[PDB]
Design a protein around this nucleic acid. Structure first.
Ligand SMILES: [Zn+2]
Lengths: 109, 58, 356, 102, 179
RNA sequence: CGAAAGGGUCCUGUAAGCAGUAGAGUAGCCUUGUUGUUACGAUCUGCUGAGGGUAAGCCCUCCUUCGCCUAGAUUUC
RNA sequence: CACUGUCCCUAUCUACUAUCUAGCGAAACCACAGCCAAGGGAACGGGCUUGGCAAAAUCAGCGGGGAAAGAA
């Protein structure tokens, strides 16, 4: 219910990248992550971590992982006359295995 | 910063693929237009020459 | 190709219409003539054949059967028709009170934001004077109409579909005076009608649906080659087809919990395949087992109606006895009918030992 | 339910079933079916170590590339103040004792 | 009808399931699926493939000798039909099947007996040379609890409680760059 | 309604690691070896029908978790 | 002698197009026009006769028409 909220999700990119041309899977996985955080947080302004872009491109252009596990953080865009008042920042997180993990809210305190 | 990338290559004696510019100090690099102003930023650590790539013969 | 199906265009409506009910005579008993169901999928059976003159007489035959899920239709209306030099004209439609929200979804294209005011004033004429408008409209059917039909709709909550909009269809009453079938129609209001009562086992029925669509194709697959008669590219599929003489091999109850059990195999199992019907789900209601292939894709509404004529074959007068019904997995090369005899065959697994 | 009745058909099957139940009585009596903290904590302790190995291995893959690239030495890069107090705090070190504020 | 068994792997071959190959010497081979048939045509040995039941019997992963498996067999001398015999046969196979399952489960527990003790000894070895990676509490937490010790009287158990909490108790890569 | 998860159903074929002189073979010690030792060691066996994948046009969900929802633009007798 | 989609008899999979959008943006060709049938002596219609008919504006395919020997 708060404008500022950080949650952790698992993205099943295997079902989102099924049958795609091999030379577009890593570019399309970036767009599907942006589409994921737009829907899950209601914010069109989505920024991806450069180290999240490293995780997607880890095994080349046609080797995107089946399941990535990220944290999406809705923060307030102050700026000066911004078009949108909120934005979501997505970062890859360090877990032993991106399987069997439910969506959870992470407490800042 | 193409001029600074070219001049740092001549100052440091390497190629432009080994010249590294500070991402957080782009405003300071931009004011450097002389080969003495770049020699400042090399000594200060803002322009750094990368080493040779690993070529393990084993 | 055939010039009989020449306007190879898409079907005008998804449901598809009967276009001909059986010819009616008043000496017969009062009965309905059609029904609706949803296509679940197909299975494999073994039938102990009794066909005198056949090479497979008193032998075992393996046949393909189609399962159509049939939740009980709810009768909500009554429509009278009169004869005309111009054709046949609808004179009077009489609905009932307490119309369900499912059929009310049918009269709306955006149910989620509407005020849901359909048939609100029609609910008030049942208690306006004493129901004078309702009784007058039924007496108009009794004294002027030559044949009357019944409006019935299916329920989507009993079926595993993401749709919520019911399918509303007119079903003709045959066999009686117009006075007798009207008193059927008013008495049948607000009442569920099962497929046990409309049809019966060992009966050829007529199946009506819209076929599988294939979009724009060329003459290689649209016509079958190496003005109207010239083979030209266009739409293949999504055509309205009426299929003829399909035998009802079984009518399951849904309550019985041994639907796939026969008198020769004593395994308490249902018709749903092990793992579920692929892209349909589970059948938890009455179902009709139809021999052979049947038009339409899975999840599509199926219209079943009675045969127009008395049959001229011994295939229609054949009692069907089933030996076993396949219940194995549609999702692969399933070699197991129930969950119980897979664990009996496999033995103890690692996850079973860690959980227990 | 997955068996052929005709395979199991055999006369005097009561004698075979009674002898099997007599065997089932002998198997119950001498106990063919009976079931017989420090080990728990060290198993959980080993699970924590195996997780730390995977986290270190994942962070190694974050810096590594598929092909060898020229990289900046750590003596050349400059590291923030807040990262040193954060990492030494995980190591369980008094960061205020070492006057880490230089 | 008869539930057949696959020649290659032994799963039940039901009617209309699979293919049957007839050889010139009079022998018919029934298969349950295309995977079993294709592996037969390229002449691979099912005793070596670990998914076939010939391997499991050869490797001892299910037991063959006991009284209940001897009670089921293929019968070549027919009996006269007897309704009392057929009803009492059905009650036998209900008893037969549940006796098998309760002996299958004991057989599996006996094979897995050494697994339980071996796993704790391997994990005991793995802890003894990895002491530095154990949960250890932050220095700021040990500082907070140093004050608290004096207040409530006590230090030792306080730490054990918050370390038990730390065990009862995932970091993100990178961070936002300030504009 | 959506995203994950769990279970089911299928596909492949027995994961990483650990352990057993089963183990061909390669080598150091002191002296006769009739039973000498000490290390490494392909391969094999067990943990392990394990491990991986599973709807993208497969199935189900008992509080399995988390989130969203009476939007806002046009047109109409 | 051996293989082969050559065929019986065909099905399936991939990439770029074909499709749609944003931006950019020609040429060939063009009397005026484009539904048929029968008749229009000069085996010549598209404009005439008299019949069939005939309802805005459009989007994709096609392979028909709007093309063709000349007489010793
Ligand atoms: Zn098999």
């Amino acid at each position: 219910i708060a404008d500022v909220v950080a949650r952790e999700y698992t993205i099943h990119l295997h079902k989102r990248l099924h049958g795609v041309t091999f030379k577009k899977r890593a570019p399309r996985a970036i767009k599907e992550i942006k589409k994921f955080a737009q829907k899950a947080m209601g914010t069109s302004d989505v920024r991806l971590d450069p180290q999240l872009n490293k995780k997607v491109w880890e095994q080349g252009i046609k080797g995107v992982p089946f399941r990535i596990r990220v944290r999406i953080s809705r923060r307030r865009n102050d700026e000066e006359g911004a078009k949108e008042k909120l934005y979501s920042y997505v970062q890859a997180v360090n877990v032993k295995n991106p399987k069997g993990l439910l969506t959870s809210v992470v407490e800042e305190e | 910063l193409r001029t600074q990338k070219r001049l740092a290559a001549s100052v440091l004696g390497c190629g432009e693929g080994k010249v590294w510019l500070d991402p957080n100090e782009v405003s300071e690099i931009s004011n450097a237009n002389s080969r003495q102003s770049i020699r400042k930023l090399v000594a200060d650590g803002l322009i750094i020459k990368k080493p040779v790539t690993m070529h393990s013969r084993s | 190709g055939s010039l009989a199906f020449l306007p190879r265009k898409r079907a005008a409506r998804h449901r598809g219409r009967v276009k001909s009910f059986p010819k009616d005579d008043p000496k017969k008993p009062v009965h309905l003539t059609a029904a609706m169901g949803y296509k679940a999928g197909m299975t494999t059976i073994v039938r102990d054949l009794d066909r005198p003159g056949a090479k497979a007489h008193k032998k075992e035959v393996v046949e393909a059967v189609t399962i159509i899920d049939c939740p009980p239709m709810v009768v909500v209306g009554l429509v009278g028709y009169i004869e005309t030099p111009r054709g046949l004209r609808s004179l009077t439609t009489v609905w009932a009170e307490h119309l369900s929200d499912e059929v009310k979804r049918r009269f709306y294209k955006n149910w989620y934001k509407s005020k849901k005011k359909a048939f609100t004033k029609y609910a008030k004429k049942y208690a306006e004077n004493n129901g004078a408008s309702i009784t007058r409209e039924l007496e108009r059917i009794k004294k002027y109409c030559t044949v009357v039909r019944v409006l019935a709709h299916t329920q989507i909550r009993k079926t595993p579909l993401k749709q919520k909009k019911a399918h509303l269809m007119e079903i003709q009453i045959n066999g009686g005076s117009v006075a007798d079938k009207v008193e059927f129609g008013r008495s049948l209001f607000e009442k569920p009608v099962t497929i046990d009562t409309i049809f019966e086992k060992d009966e050829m029925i007529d199946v009506i649906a819209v076929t599988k669509g294939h979009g724009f194709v060329g003459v290689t697959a649209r016509w079958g080659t190496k003005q109207w008669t010239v083979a030209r590219a266009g739409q293949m599929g999504y055509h309205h087809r009426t299929s003829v003489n399909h035998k009802i091999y079984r009518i399951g109850k849904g309550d019985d919990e041994a639907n796939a059990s026969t008198e020769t195999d004593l395994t308490k199992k249902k018709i749903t395949p092990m793992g579920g019907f692929v892209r349909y789900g589970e059948v938890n209601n009455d179902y009709v087992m139809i021999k052979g292939s049947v038009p339409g894709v899975k999840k599509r509404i199926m219209t079943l109606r009675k045969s127009l004529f008395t049959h001229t074959s011994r295939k229609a007068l054949e009692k069907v006895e089933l030996k076993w019904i396949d219940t194995s997995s549609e999702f692969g090369h399933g070699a197991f009918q129930t969950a119980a005899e897979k664990k009996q065959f496999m033995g103890t697994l690692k996850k079973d030992l860690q959980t227990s | 339910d997955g068996k052929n009745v005709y395979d199991y058909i055999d006369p005097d099957i009561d004698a075979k079933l009674q002898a099997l139940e007599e065997e089932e009585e002998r198997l119950e009596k001498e106990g063919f079916y009976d079931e017989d903290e420090e080990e728990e904590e060290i198993l959980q302790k080993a699970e924590y170590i195996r997780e730390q190995h995977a986290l270190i291995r994942n962070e190694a893959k974050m810096r590594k590339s598929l092909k060898n690239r020229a990289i900046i030495p750590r003596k050349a890069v400059k590291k923030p103040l807040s990262q040193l107090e954060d990492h030494l705090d995980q190591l369980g070190v008094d960061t205020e004792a070492i006057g880490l504020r230089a | 009808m008869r539930i057949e068994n696959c020649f290659f792997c032994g799963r039940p071959a039901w009617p209309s399931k699979g293919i049957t190959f007839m050889r010139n010497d009079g022998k018919a081979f029934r298969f349950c699926r295309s995977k079993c048939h294709k592996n037969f045509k390229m002449k691979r040995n099912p005793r070596k493939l670990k998914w076939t039941k010939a391997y499991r019997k050869n490797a001892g992963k299910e037991m063959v000798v006991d009284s209940t498996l001897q009670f089921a067999a293929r019968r070549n001398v027919p009996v006269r039909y007897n309704r009392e015999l057929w009803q009492k046969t059905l009650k036998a196979m209900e008893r037969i099947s549940e006796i098998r399952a309760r002996r299958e489960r004991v057989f599996y527990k006996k094979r897995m007996a050494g697994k339980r003790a071996r796993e704790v000894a391997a994990a005991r070895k793995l802890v003894a040379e990895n002491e530095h990676l154990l949960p250890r509490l932050r220095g700021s937490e040990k500082r907070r609890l140093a004050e608290l010790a004096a207040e409530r009287g006590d230090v030792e158990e306080l730490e054990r409680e918050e370390l038990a909490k730390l065990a009862s108790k995932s970091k993100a890569f990178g961070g936002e760059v300030r504009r």
